[PDB]
Amino acid sequence: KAIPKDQRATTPYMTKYERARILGTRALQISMNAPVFVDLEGETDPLRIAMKELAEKKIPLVIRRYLPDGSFEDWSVEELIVD
């Protein structure tokens, strides 16, 4: 039932699955004409643009980590420490 921010006791590191689905969904949105928040260096492939947004944490998403008891947490990808 939405655990508050002071009680979030999950791993602050972004896993490979979270990075994978964030890059996949973000790249899918970029392929569907989504507003890009980072200036492009001449890229054409959507996955490279998604990784470019992840490298600067400009992806506007938040992860709803489901807990085994039915609860969940909201860890934004901007505050998640990548790698």
Partner 1 sequence: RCSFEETVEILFEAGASAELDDCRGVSENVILGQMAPIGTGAFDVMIDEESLVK
Partner 2 sequence: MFFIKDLSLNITLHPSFFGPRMKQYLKTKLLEEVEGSCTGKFGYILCVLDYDNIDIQRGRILPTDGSAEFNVKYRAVVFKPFKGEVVDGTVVSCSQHGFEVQVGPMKVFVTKHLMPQDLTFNAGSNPPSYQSSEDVITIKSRIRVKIEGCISQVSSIHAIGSIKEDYLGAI
Kindly list the residues in this chain that would bind partner 2 in the complex (CB under 8 A): 25, 28-29, 32-35, 60
Read off the tokens for 66: 């489901």
Dihedral-angle region of residue 47 (phi above 0 means left; psi in -120 to 50 means alpha; beta otherwise): alpha
E-strand spans in 6-59?
none
Instruction: Give the shortest CB-33-to-partner 2 separation in angstroms.
Output: 5
Per-position x/- string for 19-48, each x denoting binding to partner 1 as judged by CB under 8 A, each - no binding: -xxx-xx-----------x-----------
Interface with partner 1 (CB under 8 A), residue from 11, 13, 31, 62: 62
How many CB atoms neighbour CB 6 within 10 A?
5
Residue closer to partner 1 (CB basis): 42 or 68 = 68
**Binding residue count for partner 1, defined by CB under 8 A:** 19
Pair 8, 73: CB distance under 8 Å: yes
| Single-letter amino acid code for the residue at 47 | L
Q: Which stretch binds partner 1 (CB under 8 A): 1-9, 44-52, 59-67?
A: 59-67
